[PDB]
Amino acid sequence: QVQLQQSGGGVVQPGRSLRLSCAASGFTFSSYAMHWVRQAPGKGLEWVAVISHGGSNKYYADSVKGRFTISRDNSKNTLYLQMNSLRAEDTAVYYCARDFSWRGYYMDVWGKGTLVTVSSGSETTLTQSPATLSLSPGERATLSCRASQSISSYLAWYQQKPGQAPRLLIYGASTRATGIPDRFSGSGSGTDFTLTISRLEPEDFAVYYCQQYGSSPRTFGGGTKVEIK
Amino acid sequence: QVQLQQSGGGVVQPGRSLRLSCAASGFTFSSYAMHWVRQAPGKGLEWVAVISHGGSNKYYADSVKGRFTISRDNSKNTLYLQMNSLRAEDTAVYYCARDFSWRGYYMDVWGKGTLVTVSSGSETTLTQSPATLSLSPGERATLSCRASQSISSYLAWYQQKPGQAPRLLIYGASTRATGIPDRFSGSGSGTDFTLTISRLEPEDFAVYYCQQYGSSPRTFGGGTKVEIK
């Protein structure tokens, strides 16, 4: 009977290349259009590529275009998919499918599928609250930075004026950098950290980021925007 | 004074390579650790890479590791970032930054930044309702498929039993494929489409997908799971 045998599935790391094979028998291979359809574990079907019966016309989905290649060998009766520059999102069960005819409209014969997994290649997460803070000039800003793991006071504070590069304010969670006025003050140890800006100047209205250096890799907080009201 | 001049920013397509330069003056370049930090338009700061003063030790963030490379030329007083296999998410303003010392803990001098954009290289979206449908055997299932654009009845229906490959049920939105019993019936035209499964068999409990072929590229619907209660 009509049959499609699949091979070439396995585990690869991101960036590398994989090639899948779909061996066909029971029908005239060179007279039908051929399809690849993928399905990530859990979610629905995603259409990948189509090739014409002669192999001259090839069409791809937007997500795979430029880095995926559909090909066929009509003397070998085999369909191929070259997968290059592989992302983590490319992790799916890949089905080869024979089209109804040469048209490439819809498929009536499906291969069993081969599993393709792209993985994989500890951190200290910093959370900043609040997200935004509305205040007047003369008012005082209080900013929280919470680490997922104890950092033993190895934390830095950065100011970023809109459109400008970041500027170091506090290093070591207490020490104030050279140039920085004493209305800015860093506080805290372990997991809990605070920046206090007493008597807000118009210059002080900016985005503020905390950065840890107790563990590798170095991470930032999500930021706190201090804006006028 | 202490200065960092940045260049090499621009627009590239996904997959291609870009190299950024950070030219340094006003300090002893070969005695400080060097940082790259990126910021996607709108969101916060993301730490990319660090290089030691001698250039022997290199450390990268998880998202960029394996495809990004940090390097330096101490005779040229220049820091480099080689960006390979570029994703759409890599779109950011890239800052070079001098570390406080050779340690690589935190940075006190920041470059202006260069903008890097990765873009870009019409569709008919199919929506399926409901997501799940709980029914007994003997009951009737009614399934909706809605296209974003009129497809002039060029729609196909697929059944997928759990763990198995998809199986064509209806093509052209009315016609029933060979093998398929007449308790399954497709209906509709233009944008509105329905599959009706009268008197549900135990075999019929599966996931159902609609697929359009009026426009290129070929797209699927999100699926409807028909399950027991």
Residue numbers in the entry:
A (entry chain A), B (entry chain A): 1 to 121, 127 to 234
Task: Give verbatim excerpts from the published study on this entry.
Lack of non-toxic inhibitors with defined mechanisms of action poses a serious obstacle to therapeutic interventions for diseases caused by aberrant connexin hemichannels. Here, we report the identification of a human recombinant antibody that perturbs hemichannel function. The antibody we selected is not toxic to cells, reversibly inhibits hemichannel currents and strongly reduces the activity of some Cx26 hyperactive mutants.
For antibody discovery, we screened a single-chain fragment variable (scFv) combinatorial antibody library expressed in phage. The advantage of a synthetic phage library is that it enables full control over the in vitro selection process, allows to obtain highly functional binders rapidly and at lower cost, does not rely on adjuvants which can unfold proteins, and may contain over 40 billion highly stable human antibody clones. Unpaired connexin hemichannels in the cell plasma membrane are kept in a predominantly closed state by at least one of the following mechanisms: (a) pore occlusion by mM levels of extracellular Ca2+ and Mg2+; (b) negative membrane potential; (c) post-translational modifications (e.g., phosphorylation). Open hemichannels lack ion selectivity and mediate autocrine/paracrine signaling by the release or uptake of small molecules including ATP, amino acids, reduced glutathione, NAD+, prostaglandin E2, and cyclic nucleotides, which are critical for cell-cell communication and the regulation of inflammatory responses. Of the thirteen dominant Cx26 mutations responsible for KID/HID syndrome (G11E, G12R, N14K, N14Y, S17F, I30N, A40V, G45E, D50A, D50N, D50Y, A88V) at least eight are thought to translate into hyperactive or “leaky” hemichannels (G11E, G12R, N14K, N14Y, A40V, G45E, D50A, D50N, A88V) that do not close correctly in response to extracellular Ca2+ or show an altered permeability to this critically important cation and second messenger compromising cell viability in vitro.
